[PDB]
Structure 1
């Protein structure tokens, strides 16, 4: 994901912001996090 992007786990409500991009897919509670 890209710098500045915001991602949410719809299952546990966790929310993260990307500070440094990397090519992996962010996952939480076993599912792909959802970009906001």
Structure 2
């Protein structure tokens, strides 16, 4: 997505800080993680 970003799941509540962007999404709990 964009280095130095954070993605939090709106289901479990998993938060991960992207340190290396790629070209996809973090579908967690069958739901595309949200950005913080």
Question: What TM-score do you get using the length of structure 1 for normalisation?
Answer: 0.89
After superposition, the CA RMSD in angstroms is: 0.6
Size of the alignment, in residue pairs?
Answer: 36
User: Structure 2: which 5+ runs fail to align?
Assistant: none
Deviation at 1:16, TM superposition (A): 0.4
For normalisation by structure 2, the TM-score amounts to 0.89
Unaligned runs of 5+ in 1: none
Runs of 4 or more consecutive aligned structure 1 residues displaced over 4 Å after TM superposition: none
